[PDB]
Design a protein around this ligand. Structure first.
Ligand SMILES: [Zn+2]
Lengths: 199, 76, 99, 54, 50, 149, 50, 209
C-alpha cells in the first residue's frame, strides 16, 4: 500500500510537470511576442517601436538588473567598505574621527565627477557614512579613544580604523560601480523581462 | 555630450565585428600584429590599443545625433 | 575561516566567491578561478576517495527505539482523536469543519 | 405544499371560491374547503457565527 | 507549421550539428570540445588577406 | 416561496463571503477583513472600513475604482507576491516595466491577442501571432501601410 | 564489477567512467543489424527490372 | 437611519471640500477640518437636513485663477436624477451665470440623463459623481500616487527637455476616477510622483486622451 501511494504521488508530480511544460511554453511565447518591441534608448527613456514612451526611466532609477549586487540594491556599502579596507590597508596613516570623516566625505563628494550621479545614491552614501561615523564615535567613547592621536595603547585604533585614502577609494569604487551598473542603451529590455518572467 | 561616456557592450561588439570584417577584406592594420591569423584578435588588439578608425554616431529618438570617437569613449 | 559549500561556491544566490571575483576584478579572473577549481577539486576527491555504501544508510539501535516509541505515541494520539470525533464532541479548529 | 386529488391524483392548486379558499384540481371538479389553519414549515438552516480565523 | 511560425519566425539553417554531450572538467568554462568528424563538415569562409 | 428565501436583507450583493483575519503581531493583535467578492467600491464605502488602506486582487476593479496608477501598483504587488510565494525572486524592475507596458495607454490591456492588437500597430506582427487571415484581410481592406520599425 | 566513487571528475552529473581494458576484452561489445531491401517488379508492359 | 446617513453626508461634504481645495478653489481651513460635531450643529437629523438646497454650495470660487469664476455643487434628493432635474439645474446655473457645476447623485444617473448631460453645452460643464465614490477620498489612498496638473509652461519645458510631442506621452482616459476627481480635460498633462521603496521618488507624466 505504501509503494502504491508513493507511485500515485510520483505520477501526480509527473503529470503536473507535463502540464506545466506546455502551459509555461505558451505563456512564454505570448509574453515574448508582446514584449519584444521595447528597447532602451540613449536618452534613458524606454520607447516602443512606434516611438511612444513606456517609461521615462527604466525601473525609476535606471540600473541593470544583471549588475545588481545587493537585494534589489546597486551596492552593499558594508561589503564594499570591508573590501576597500582589506585591499588597501594604510599603516602609515592615522585613523579618522567622526568630524574628520564627515568633513572629508563632504569635500570629496562635492567634486565634478559626482555631480552627474543620481541624488538618491549620493543620499545613501551620506547615510552610510553618517552611520559608520556614529559607530566610530560610539567605539571611541566606549574605549575613550582621543581624536588627537596620542592615546598610549595604539591597538585601540585597530577597532574601527579608517584613513582618508580608504575613504577616497571607497567613494571612487562606489561611483564607478554605480556608473557601470546603469542600463546600457540599445539593450532589448522587453525580451529580457519576458524571459525572466517566463522561466 | 549628454549620453553615457562609457562604451556599451553592444557598441564594442559592433565595432569589433566591423573592424574584423574590414581586416578580412584587406584593410590596413595600425598595431603591427605579431602572428595573429584571426581578424577578430587583430580587432581586439586595435580596440585595446585605441587605434580603431571608427566613430560611433549615436542617434537620439527625436532625430538628433552625436559623434563619439572610440579613443574618446571609455572601455572596460 | 569557514568551509566552502553551496552557499559560497554554489549558484544559489549572492555572496558567492566567484561572484565577488567577477564584480571586483573582472570576468577573466573569475573564469580562471573557476577553471582552477574544476581542475583541482576532482584530483583531490579522487586521491582521497568518496564512496557510499549500504552501511551509510542503515539505522541505529537507538534510532529504531526512538522510531518505535514515536510511532506508538502517534498511533495512540490518532486513535484518541478518532474516538473523540466518532464518539463525542471533538474540538473544532477555526475556519474548518470537524473532519 | 404539494397535495394531490384523491380522485385523479393531480396537483391541487389553491383558489378563492365563493365562500372560502379551497384546494382544487385543474382536471376534475373535485374541491376541498379549508376549515382550520394549515401550515408547512421549512426551517432553513441559518447563518452561523463564523470565527476569527487567523 | 505555418509560414509565419514555421518558415519566418523559426526556420532551419545549415552549418549546424546536433550531438550528445559528455562531461569534461579539463576545459575552460568558455571553451567547448568539438569532434574531428563534425569539425571536418562545418566549414568557415575565411577571406585571404595579407 | 422559492425566491423569497434568497432575497438579501443586508450586505453588498456582489460580496459572497467575508471573514475576519487576525494578525498576531507581538506588539498588538489586529483584525482585518478578507472579502471573497468583486466589488471594491462598495467595500470602501461601507461604514467602519478604512478605505485608504484597502487593496484588491482583481486588477480591473482597481483600475475602474482608484485609477490607472492604482492598477499598476496592484499588478506589481500581486506579481511580486505570487512570485515570492514560490520562493523565487525577480527584480522589481521587470514587473514594473511589464505593468507600465500594460498601463501606458490609460487602460489595463492584457497580453492576449486583443490587448496585443490594441497596443501594437504593426500588421505583420499581429498576423504572425494569431488570427493570420483575419488580420491580413482587415489590413488589405484598410490599406494600412506597415513600417519596418 | 561497479565501484561507487568519484574519479577524475568525469562523472559529475549521472555520467560514468568505463575501463579501457574491460571494453577491450569484449565488455559492452554490441552488434547492429540493418536491412536493405530492393524490389524488381514487372510493370504493365512486357518489361522487367534487370 | 439618522446616524449613518448624517455620517455619510458629513464625509461627502469633507471629500467635496478636499476636492475643491485640490482643484484650487477657495475654501477656508474650517471647511476643510470640519468635525462631525459641527455638522450635527448645522443639522443633526435626516429630515431636518436638506439634500437639494441645504447642502448646495455656491461660494466655491477659483481665487488662484479668478474670483469671478464660480463653481457649484448639487446634491439631488431623488435616487435617480431625471431630465427635468438636469434642466432645472441648468436654468438655475444660467440665472446665476455659473459655468462649472457638480452633481452628487445618490444611486445613479439614467442613460438618457447621462447622454443629455454629456451634450448640455460646451460652456456649461457638469460632472457626474456618485455618493458611493465620494465616501472615500481617492487622493488619500495609499496606492494612488500624488498627481499634479501641470501648466502649459511646464508642459512646454518638458517637451523641450525631452524633445517629445503631445501624442508621445503616456495616455490616461478622461473617465479615470482621478481624472474626474481633478476635472482635467483633453490636452492637459498630469505629473505623478510615485513613492519608491527607497527615500527617492519616481516622476512620470501622463496626457489626458
Ligand atoms: Zn384532482
Amino acid at each position: 500500500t505504501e509503494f502504491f501511494f508513493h507511485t500515485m504521488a510520483g505520477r501526480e508530480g509527473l503529470v503536473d510537470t507535463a502540464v506545466k511544460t506546455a502551459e509555461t511554453g505558451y505563456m512564454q511565447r505570448r509574453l515574448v511576442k508582446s514584449l519584444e518591441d521595447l528597447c532602451s534608448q540613449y536618452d534613458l527613456t524606454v520607447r516602443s517601436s512606434t516611438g511612444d514612451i513606456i517609461q521615462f526611466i527604466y525601473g525609476g532609477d535606471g540600473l541593470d538588473p544583471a549588475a545588481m549586487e545587493g537585494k534589489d540594491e546597486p551596492l552593499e556599502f558594508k561589503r564594499v567598505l570591508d573590501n576597500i579596507k582589506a585591499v588597501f590597508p594604510c599603516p602609515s596613516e592615522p585613523a579618522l574621527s567622526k568630524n574628520e570623516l564627515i568633513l572629508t566625505t563632504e569635500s570629496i563628494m562635492k567634486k565634478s565627477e559626482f555631480l552627474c550621479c543620481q541624488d538618491s545614491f549620493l543620499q545613501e552614501i551620506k547615510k552610510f557614512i553618517k552611520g559608520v561615523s556614529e559607530k566610530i564615535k560610539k567605539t571611541r567613547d566606549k574605549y575613550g579613544i582621543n581624536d588627537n592621536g596620542t592615546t598610549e595603547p595604539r591597538v585601540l585604533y585597530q577597532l574601527d580604523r579608517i584613513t582618508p585614502t580608504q575613504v577616497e577609494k571607497f567613494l571612487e569604487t562606489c561611483r564607478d560601480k554605480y556608473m557601470r551598473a546603469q542600463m546600457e542603451p540599445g539593450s532589448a529590455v522587453g525580451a529580457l523581462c519576458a524571459q525572466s518572467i517566463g522561466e | 555630450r549628454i549620453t553615457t561616456p562609457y562604451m556599451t557592450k553592444y557598441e564594442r561588439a559592433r565595432v569589433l565585428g566591423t573592424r574584423a570584417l574590414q581586416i578580412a577584406m584587406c584593410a590596413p592594420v595600425m598595431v603591427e600584429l605579431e602572428g595573429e591569423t584571426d581578424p577578430l584578435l587583430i580587432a581586439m588588439k586595435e580596440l585595446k590599443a585605441r587605434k580603431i578608425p571608427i566613430i560611433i554616431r549615436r542617434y537620439l529618438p527625436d532625430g538628433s545625433y552625436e559623434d563619439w570617437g572610440v579613443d574618446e569613449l571609455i572601455i572596460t | 575561516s569557514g568551509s566552502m559549500d553551496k552557499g559560497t561556491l554554489g549558484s544559489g544566490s549572492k555572496n558567492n566567491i566567484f561572484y565577488i571575483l567577477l564584480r571586483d576584478w573582472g570576468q577573466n579572473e573569475a573564469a580562471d578561478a573557476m577553471s582552477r577549481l574544476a581542475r583541482l577539486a576532482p584530483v583531490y576527491l579522487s586521491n582521497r576517495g568518496f564512496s557510499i555504501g549500504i552501511g551509510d544508510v542503515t539505522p541505529g539501535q537507538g534510532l529504531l527505539k526512538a522510531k518505535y516509541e514515536l510511532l506508538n505515541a502517534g498511533y495512540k494520539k490518532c486513535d484518541e482523536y478518532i474516538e473523540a470525533l466518532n464518539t463525542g464532541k471533538l474540538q473544532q479548529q477555526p475556519g474548518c469543519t470537524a473532519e | 405544499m404539494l397535495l394531490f386529488c384523491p380522485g385523479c391524483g393531480n396537483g391541487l392548486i389553491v383558489e378563492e371560491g365563493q365562500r372560502c379558499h379551497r384546494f382544487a384540481c385543474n382536471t376534475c371538479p373535485y374541491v376541498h374547503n379549508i376549515t382550520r389553519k394549515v401550515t408547512n414549515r421549512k426551517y432553513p438552516k441559518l447563518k452561523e457565527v463564523d470565527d476569527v480565523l487567523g | 507549421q505555418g509560414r509565419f511560425r514555421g518558415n519566418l519566425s523559426g526556420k532551419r539553417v545549415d552549418f549546424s550539428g546536433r550531438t550528445v554531450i559528455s562531461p569534461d572538467p579539463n576545459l575552460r568554462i568558455d571553451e567547448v570540445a568539438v569532434p574531428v568528424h563534425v569539425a571536418k563538415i562545418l566549414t568557415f569562409p575565411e577571406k585571404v588577406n595579407k | 416561496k422559492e425566491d423569497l428565501p434568497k432575497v438579501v436583507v443586508q450586505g453588498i450583493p456582489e460580496v459572497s463571503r467575508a471573514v475576519i483575519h487576525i494578525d498576531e503581531q507581538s506588539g498588538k493583535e489586529k483584525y482585518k477583513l478578507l472579502v471573497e467578492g468583486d466589488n471594491l467600491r462598495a467595500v470602501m464605502a461601507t461604514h467602519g472600513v478604512k478605505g485608504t488602506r484597502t487593496t484588491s486582487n482583481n486588477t480591473y476593479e482597481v483600475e475602474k475604482t482608484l485609477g490607472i496608477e492604482a492598477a499598476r501598483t496592484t499588478i506589481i504587488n500581486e506579481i511580486q507576491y505570487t512570485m515570492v510565494n514560490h520562493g523565487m525572486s525577480i527584480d522589481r524592475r521587470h514587473v514594473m516595466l511589464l505593468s507600465d507596458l500594460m498601463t501606458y495607454k490609460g487602460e489595463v490591456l492584457g497580453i492576449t491577442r486583443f490587448g496585443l492588437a490594441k497596443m501594437k500597430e504593426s500588421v505583420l506582427m499581429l498576423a504572425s501571432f494569431e488570427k493570420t487571415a483575419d488580420h491580413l484581410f482587415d489590413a488589405a481592406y484598410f490599406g494600412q501601410k506597415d513600417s519596418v520599425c | 564489477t561497479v565501484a561507487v566513487m568519484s574519479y577524475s571528475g568525469y562523472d559529475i552529473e549521472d555520467a560514468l567512467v568505463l575501463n579501457k581494458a574491460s571494453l577491450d576484452r569484449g565488455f559492452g561489445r554490441c552488434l547492429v543489424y540493418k536491412n536493405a531491401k530492393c524490389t524488381l517488379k514487372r510493370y504493365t508492359n512486357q518489361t522487367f527490372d534487370k | 437611519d439618522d446616524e449613518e446617513e448624517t455620517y455619510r453626508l458629513w464625509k461627502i461634504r469633507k471629500t467635496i471640500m478636499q476636492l475643491c481645495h485640490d482643484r484650487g478653489y477657495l475654501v477656508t481651513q474650517d471647511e476643510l477640518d470640519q468635525t462631525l460635531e459641527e455638522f450635527k450643529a448645522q443639522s443633526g437629523d435626516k429630515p431636518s437636513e436638506g439634500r437639494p438646497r441645504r447642502t448646495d454650495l455656491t461660494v466655491l470660487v477659483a481665487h488662484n485663477d479668478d474670483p469671478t469664476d464660480q463653481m457649484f455643487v448639487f446634491f439631488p434628493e431623488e435616487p435617480k436624477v431625471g431630465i427635468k432635474t438636469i434642466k432645472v439645474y441648468c436654468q438655475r446655473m444660467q440665472e446665476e451665470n455659473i459655468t462649472r457645476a457638480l452633481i452628487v447623485v445618490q444611486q445613479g444617473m439614467t442613460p438618457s440623463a447621462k447622454q443629455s448631460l454629456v451634450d448640455m453645452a460646451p460652456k456649461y460643464i457638469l460632472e457626474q459623481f456618485l455618493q458611493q465614490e465620494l465616501l472615500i477620498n481617492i487622493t488619500e489612498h495609499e496606492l494612488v500616487p500624488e498627481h499634479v496638473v501641470m501648466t502649459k509652461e511646464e508642459v512646454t519645458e518638458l517637451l523641450a527637455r525631452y524633445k517629445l510631442r503631445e501624442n508621445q506621452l503616456p495616455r490616461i482616459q478622461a473617465g479615470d476616477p482621478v481624472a474626474r476627481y481633478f476635472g482635467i480635460k483633453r490636452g492637459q498633462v498630469v505629473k505623478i510622483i510615485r513613492p519608491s521603496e527607497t527615500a527617492g521618488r519616481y516622476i512620470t507624466y501622463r496626457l489626458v486622451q
